[PDB]
Ligand binder design. Sequence first.
Ligand SMILES: Cc1cc2nc3c(=O)[nH]c(=O)nc-3n(C[C@H](O)[C@H](O)[C@H](O)COP(=O)(O)OP(=O)(O)OC[C@H]3O[C@@H](n4cnc5c(N)ncnc54)[C@H](O)[C@@H]3O)c2cc1C
Ligand SMILES: Cc1cc2nc3c(=O)[nH]c(=O)nc-3n(C[C@H](O)[C@H](O)[C@H](O)COP(=O)(O)OP(=O)(O)OC[C@H]3O[C@@H](n4cnc5c(N)ncnc54)[C@H](O)[C@@H]3O)c2cc1C
Ligand SMILES: COCc1nnc(N)s1
Ligand SMILES: COCc1nnc(N)s1
Ligand SMILES: COCc1nnc(N)s1
Ligand SMILES: COCc1nnc(N)s1
Lengths: 588, 587
Amino acid sequence: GTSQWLRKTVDSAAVILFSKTTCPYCKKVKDVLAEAKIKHATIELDQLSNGSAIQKCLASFSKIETVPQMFVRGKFIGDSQTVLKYYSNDELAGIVNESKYDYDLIVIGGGSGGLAAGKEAAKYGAKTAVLDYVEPTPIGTTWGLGGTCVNVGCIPKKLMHQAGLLSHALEDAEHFGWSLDRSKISHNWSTMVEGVQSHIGSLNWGYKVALRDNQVTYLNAKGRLISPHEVQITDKNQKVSTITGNKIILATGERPKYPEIPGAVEYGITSDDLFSLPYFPGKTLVIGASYVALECAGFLASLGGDVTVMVRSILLRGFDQQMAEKVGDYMENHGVKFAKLCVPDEIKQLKVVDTENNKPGLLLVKGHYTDGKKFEEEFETVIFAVGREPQLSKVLCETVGVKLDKNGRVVCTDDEQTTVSNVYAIGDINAGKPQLTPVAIQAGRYLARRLFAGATELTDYSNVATTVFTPLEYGACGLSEEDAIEKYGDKDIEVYHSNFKPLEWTVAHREDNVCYMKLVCRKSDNMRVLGLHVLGPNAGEITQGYAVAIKMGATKADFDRTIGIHPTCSETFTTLHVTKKSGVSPIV
Amino acid sequence: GTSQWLRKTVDSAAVILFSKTTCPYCKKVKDVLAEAKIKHATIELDQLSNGSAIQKCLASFSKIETVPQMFVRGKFIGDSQTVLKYYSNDELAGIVNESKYDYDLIVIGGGSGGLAAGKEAAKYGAKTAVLDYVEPTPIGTTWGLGGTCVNVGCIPKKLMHQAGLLSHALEDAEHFGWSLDRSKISHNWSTMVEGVQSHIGSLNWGYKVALRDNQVTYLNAKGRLISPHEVQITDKNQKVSTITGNKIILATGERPKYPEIPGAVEYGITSDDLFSLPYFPGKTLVIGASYVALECAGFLASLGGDVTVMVRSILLRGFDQQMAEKVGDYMENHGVKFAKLCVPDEIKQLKVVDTENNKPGLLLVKGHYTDGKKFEEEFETVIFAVGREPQLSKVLCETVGVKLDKNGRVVCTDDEQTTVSNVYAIGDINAGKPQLTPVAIQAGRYLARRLFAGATELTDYSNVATTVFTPLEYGACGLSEEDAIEKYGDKDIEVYHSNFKPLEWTVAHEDNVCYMKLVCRKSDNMRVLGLHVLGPNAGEITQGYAVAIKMGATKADFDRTIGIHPTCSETFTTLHVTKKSGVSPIV
Ligand SMILES: Cc1cc2nc3c(=O)[nH]c(=O)nc-3n(C[C@H](O)[C@H](O)[C@H](O)COP(=O)(O)OP(=O)(O)OC[C@H]3O[C@@H](n4cnc5c(N)ncnc54)[C@H](O)[C@@H]3O)c2cc1C
Ligand SMILES: Cc1cc2nc3c(=O)[nH]c(=O)nc-3n(C[C@H](O)[C@H](O)[C@H](O)COP(=O)(O)OP(=O)(O)OC[C@H]3O[C@@H](n4cnc5c(N)ncnc54)[C@H](O)[C@@H]3O)c2cc1C
Ligand SMILES: COCc1nnc(N)s1
Ligand SMILES: COCc1nnc(N)s1
Ligand SMILES: COCc1nnc(N)s1
Ligand SMILES: COCc1nnc(N)s1
């Protein structure tokens, strides 16, 4: 029924007004609340299909059936006359601030999702605290508010990716008639790092301002859920206390793993350290083969570093393997070396990091290949990118009763709820969800709208598009080719594909047949597009809009009947015709 | 119903075979035709939903109801025994070349649409000729096969744009840590033009190879339609002759206009001349305000030139006017000067063009502003971008009966047919269609499939997306904002909008110049009627969304899709400020 919607809304909301748009009785209660510096949500009943039934159900609480009606934290406050009887008597602040807990909402985690949920909750009148603390890395690195993307993730990595792209810009400029000689131009690592850290510092500051201007309490404190409604916090001075909240959101993210081998923690670094490193890495070994490892190797080479990637098995496990091979081939051709089917055994120190003179150390790496032969080479810097994990034992006492999966992530329902009914989890620690910043933001915002404004919208987690920012970018939306075959059978999968060449590469004398795209389609379902894949420049900008068409169920015919924009790389999707079954070449 | 399809299909097809995939007798006839190099179309009756009706209806032509049946130019040739008999007896080649006309298809015009139409028809066995001739510009400029885009349009204009974009990329490089100093780097015009002309030459060559390998006859001759089936050709040696064809496609495009003022033809140039000009233009006056005018003024500025645009009234007439003003404001902050509400009266010559030393001349331009005040300035080069027109009197005798609208364009039904039943028109001269290269290509290809392979798919001309390649690009798909209010009323229109800033612009040091909006319809589930974005890589951004708009996308379809981070395009997935709210769109 409607009755248990209405009654979840009233129960959970902080301050909420049931109202209508034509009623000037409601319009005067609003203006009172605005000037009184009171935030609230507002269900306009004349714009809901079944506003009539809701008016009746309000009477179960208030014994009346008209509008406006104001509730605070589950209790009916009054109608239009009673609100002004409280206002002019100056009894209104004591009533709107009445609560069994310190906060309506405590977010443990000040990253992508944490800050996004906190700000949206506060819009609708919820008393909100946001906790953030950055445990330092083994060598001591630390940073400010905003989470992993803002400080040591998407933002600093794409900015260094852009710095790497601009070396090809300097090469190309010669052929388009500019008088520079790229031969005599070199890169300065620490000038880059200063500009990058300057931008991050402005996001740190901007988030503190945003929280302040939304009346959100920010505590730079480590938090721990000790009971369903109690969060124990620790100061920067080591002072412990306890705060209480009605709803809890866990949004604490992950940190990089190290392999269990001698020397790794003591002498290597991870991505957490790379984006503010005060010396150029020098001769670098990257261990691992995820998108983090290949993206960092890619711009290290483009800035002129001597870069090696040690690969256990394959590149980009979980991604379309034909495209992953195309990515790796391009990198191998443009400076990155690979040591294939190889694994490390220990890291030995030969020289200590020189802090005063700003120089890396010197390390000796010992490893072995799957056949048996030995790996032994010296590097100045060794970077581990062997995956990320959460440490929920630090965040969450086991007696609270929040269930975790065998990987240590939180098992949630489809509306982010944990096994404890007032506790939710969003972002990287939610089991089974894609680990991406815009996913966490969308989840956090939609959930706050459900707890405090009566919203029903859920987050849709399927067919979320991605881009890997390797020297040649790789964008994808949907199934990889081998997953669609495995799920529907090779006879039911048709794949259209083609090479291409950006117009911008013609005068520049770049390669003819390295850029590549394909559509993986289901025959028996009107050639429905199951996955889209593209290797080339600006692959993120290319892929993104097609994610809407695929969310709507696009078919091959939908692509055929749409006309291209000329000249672009993206238009090549609108005229594809060569099937893989056919055996015809895809070259240009 | 099905009946009238199969009679239209049999009459216009050149060589066509009706068959079934599972039939070894049809396979036997296919294998004979491959070996004899006899190109043909093929209808596979067992993959069509009314193949049974078609099968019975073939008997009205062939007095049989079995497959495989082969036709040539409206005549039943036989079943598998009759065809093999012809093969074995050496009679099959003469039968399949029997024609009342010289060609199954004559295309007049070897540009974007004509080449696409020509190459596609040949795949189905049509005996095809393609005609192309380039009348020179007033100063003598001419070029090779491929049309306006390939030679004096999209392809050279975007390479030159690209040259201009690299100048800001050299600036940005310093801030991201590269040692270069932008201040001591300069641009060589003739080096660029050589690289551009070299790529165009490779396209000229590749199209000639393409026509050769499809057995299309290429005649570098001017063609004129003198009767429904007769095309008069004139040689590069002025030899005149007449060829005949069953179906005629007109695809002759347009050329730039000149204003009727003294000195304009004698001392100015147009875009036709600019992309192969041997000298740098110098101080340039661009007259006009279309996307050609603004794109060219744009890269000439970025390459270091002193550039002025003379605007009669507004910029980008017919495009969303708020977006056009943003496009022009950005150009004005980055070098381009504007002479607003202004029109030219005459061009006077001060220095002739110096061919020996490779230098432009010198000109005095006189004009007036709308209030009467006078304009008088000196420039080395004057570029007219005051529109384009067909000249179908050069193409089409009046007595053939092909009807034209009041602009001289061809009035066509929604299958590209003219008032004469064997004559079709495609591309720029098709009245009322967006004048774009992918549109011409799609129309020429789809039409050839209907004339010669029994296809029925029409070309969809609605909601075709565009990009204007100004220094900051402007992508668009669907109705402008003012157009949508005119059609549905202000109360039924919601506009969501936001400024944004590329991540690449942060370390490189404007905050709120990039902009995008969605124009929606309240009473139709908030249906997206127009998408607009100003920013970098706007074509790459806009294109994919054109599929979702074609499928009828709403605001909720945009909200429920997750973004790709960090990108510019992802800002479309989280828009929330409305124009009626009065809230500011900056970030
Ligand atoms: C190198 C790298 C590059 C990436 N690039 C991209 C990209 O291009 N695009 C993309 O979409 N995603 C990218 N990601 C993934 C993206 O960063 C994550 O999906 C996202 O940051 C997860 O958000 P979150 O809110 O769940 O966690 P986080 O952003 O990690 O925020 C959690 C915060 O809570 C803090 N915290 C932890 N424990 C406690 C505690 N007990 N008390 C208080 N605070 C605590 C953490 O220190 C942190 O500040 C990248 C990740 C990495 C590592
Ligand atoms: C500066 C500029 C930039 C442009 N940029 C873009 C862009 O970025 N994207 C886009 O989509 N569109 C762009 N266009 C438009 C695009 O060029 C046209 O839409 C396209 O060329 C139309 O093709 P068409 O086949 O109709 O004609 P055309 O390509 O003009 O082909 C006509 C051909 O027929 C020849 N011909 C004429 N008369 C005869 C005759 N009697 N006998 C034989 N041959 C004859 C002509 O000389 C020419 O070779 C641009 C146009 C210009 C001028
Ligand atoms: C539990 O760690 C104590 C803390 N140190 N710095 C903070 N900001 S909180
Ligand atoms: C998830 O696998 C982590 C690793 N990758 N490369 C290694 N050598 S260990
Ligand atoms: C009037 O034009 C005669 C020509 N015909 N084809 C050429 N190449 S010159
Ligand atoms: C034929 O000329 C008409 C014009 N169009 N734009 C101008 N500035 S003058």
